[PDB]
Design a protein around this ligand. Structure first.
Ligand SMILES: [Cl-]
Ligand SMILES: [Cl-]
Ligand SMILES: [Cl-]
Ligand SMILES: [Cl-]
Lengths: 224, 224, 224, 225
């Protein structure tokens, strides 16, 4: 298996892209520590890591309501803060928590499950977009720093991928959705969650040691 | 004057790039409201705009200590939050406050004084870089939304530019600094604050109405 | 005037964006050498520069039919080569011819009139897009090299701008064009040629000495 | 079984640049690799290679030319400039244009272009080469979304600091100057092996990557980050 003998800490394992990651990574021989801890709590990240034991791979899987269609003037203080609390501050907490053991072993893997809203204008998702931009910045800044210790940090910039938070079954079923998707997505279809996990698998495996601090657009061509 | 008759609200007018903006913009006919209000306080932005009255241009000038050289493991919770509190959350507060009057008139200008740390890896500036990324994301997300109302929102991604916060006189006077800068900056010199204000002048003027949601790198070639 | 006392060599001055550059640059005090030489001929660029004498600014104004709608399979060898012959190879010839005098003086300005098709996928313009990418590459590669001699080379990545080659009056007049433009351009209008010349003015002036090897997207938000 | 089981892969200039490791890794993964050595600077050669090849599932567009490291803009004469485009730009469109009809007929296909991080950021002392690699990156950016409508993936590997003879031959990498420059500019602090490059190509050639469309993946140890 491509992750044989590896132990993978997956945050918010039932949220966002976690379910397909469990399936694919376990098929490939990984032991997946499927964590559900609320990492918006200061100190929670360090406790998760202490309890996990030996970690080879951190999958930083965070999601928050995009509030599709909410305008800049409707983006009130609470909606804005919730975006940062939910997917930005926990990212640094969990990465800072895992890095010491990575540095000790001069080896580690971090895959951040981000969004193409961190790459290009995404209509009607202002606060969410800026929070994903901050995550992208985290990978851009941490990646080259951690690479000195043979640690890979990379960012999957997904869009048009099936999940509960952004492309849930009721939303993607309408003719209106399908028409817009055909206009905007060159490949003309949504990604499956398994397809996302296969990219994550590459970035989590030792097949990708030379990829550092990169944002890989997983969007059917949307941001091209 | 290239800003003749225009009223310009400048945040944190004594910090970062504000002083040269005052000088250049007033030279060009603008009335510059030089604001010193602490916009980390909820409610402050709306109060500033109400007092300011008619605004043609918002200059979103925010800065925070980059903590040059501090690594990921030394980036504690407080340092991280301070970066977002100082330059990320206030940016939405002040833009959200100015947009309503722009939307009534279907005309507006916002110039965000950001950093090239929002574009590329900047050694030893992790939290600052991610917060500047969030600002770049704000311009990327808001720009196209606001452009439907004929409002320009753009981002200056500066680096290697003279200012108190990042390139202060004592720091830039050493031989070691100058040798590092010669290696990293193709132009081989720092920018003046006036040079920065001249780019901001272009983006604040009606000469730049077709520039929407862009990051212009102001870095002597560093990120090229 | 913002170009007072400057001499500007403008290639293909009766094509693409040249007319508005003549008008705006002359308004700002420049002597504009409006060149009409076929720079696809080896040797022509050096003869143009010999006849021009002292040049402060080179405006590299090149355009070729984009063949809107022609697909990859219909992009035949002649169409492909014509794109490179028309806008790629002449660009190096003319920049190579002007750089020596800039290097004697350790000062110079080059503005390359490119396209946002050098930045993002542009439906139905394959050969043209790749050739504009090559021009973008020329600015990216030459910019930092020339900056060591205090020479600025930058790239305007335009789209949705009025001109004979891409957005000519008959094409832009139709309801169908306007509805597509409203969907794809956040600003919801085309740029005027004068607006393009005002960005070029900034980049050709000594107000922009710190801008090195950059691509500035002039597209109403299209690529944002 | 192998991740390219049953697949037939046309690999251009198979002994040059990154071709040898592609053959090794792809064959280990069950691919049949058509290792081509045809000079694709000749008009008509691409379509002849493709007709000779038979059924193709994957095109690996592997092209290289001397970067002329250190040659300045003023020293980049007409021949040096033209040769960069002749060698890696014009052949890329010829060979992709030649393979796309069968991909379109089957509504399935894979193209991996072996490019360079010189298509992404300033690369000191490689001017003509950088612009030619930009043109290749433009080709993927422009073709990728067009070909995706036919369920064809086209992607670009933007490599730097990667084992190959064209850019990292022994004398170049042996100098103190090179090692100091690498340590300052390459976050991972080492060159990649060609096998590592082929493992990224393997992902992009496989059906594990169908949602990746027109992308430039930087393979450079973090250099361009
Ligand atoms: Cl998604
Ligand atoms: Cl700065
Ligand atoms: Cl145009
Ligand atoms: Cl390489």
């Amino acid at each position: 298996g491509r992750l044989a003998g590896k132990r993978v800490l997956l945050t918010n394992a039932d949220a966002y892209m976690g379910e397909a990651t469990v399936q694919v990574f376990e098929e490939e021989g990984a032991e997946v520590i499927a964590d559900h801890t609320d990492l918006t709590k200061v100190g929670a990240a360090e406790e998760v890591v202490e309890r996990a034991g030996h970690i080879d791979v951190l999958v930083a899987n965070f999601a928050v309501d995009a509030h599709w269609g909410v305008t800049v003037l409707e983006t009130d203080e609470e909606l804005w803060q919730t975006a940062y609390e939910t997917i930005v501050h926990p990212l640094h907490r969990i990465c800072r928590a895992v890095l010491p053991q990575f540095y000790e072993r001069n080896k580690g893997k971090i895959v951040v499950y981000g969004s193409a809203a961190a790459m290009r204008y995404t209509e009607g998702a202002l606060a969410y977009s800026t929070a994903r931009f901050a995550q992208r910045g985290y990978v851009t800044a941490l990646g080259p720093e951690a690479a000195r210790h043979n640690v890979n940090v990379n960012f999957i910039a997904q869009h048009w991928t099936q999940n509960k938070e952004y492309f849930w079954p009721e939303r993607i079923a309408t003719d209106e959705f399908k028409e817009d998707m055909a206009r905007r997505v060159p490949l003309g279809r949504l990604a499956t969650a398994r397809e996302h996990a296969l990219l994550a698998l590459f970035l989590a495996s030792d097949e990708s040691d030379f990829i550092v601090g990169k944002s890989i657009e997983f969007d059917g061509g949307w941001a091209t």
